[PDB]
């Protein structure tokens, strides 16, 4: 089990690497999987597009893991 944390915020770059949810937008769990080799819970996902949903334009939603 990961720990997996995120907070509003709407300045996502290209410069790093960062994955963001654009509101309406669902968050893609496999891409995850393949972009941090590790398994993403659909628990954790459905809470991140919970966020979006909420989320106004302009805004976007930080997701990442940790152990």
């Known amino acids: 089990m990961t720990t997996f944390t995120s907070i509003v915020t709407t300045n996502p770059d290209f410069g790093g690497f960062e994955f963001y949810v654009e509101a309406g937008q669902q968050f893609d769990d496999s ?30 939603l930080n997701v990442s893991h940790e152990a």
């Open 31 to 60: 891409a995850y999987e393949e972009a941090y080799g590790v398994s993403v819970p659909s628990a954790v996902v459905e809470e991140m597009n919970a966020k979006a949903a909420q989320l106004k334009d302009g805004e976007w």
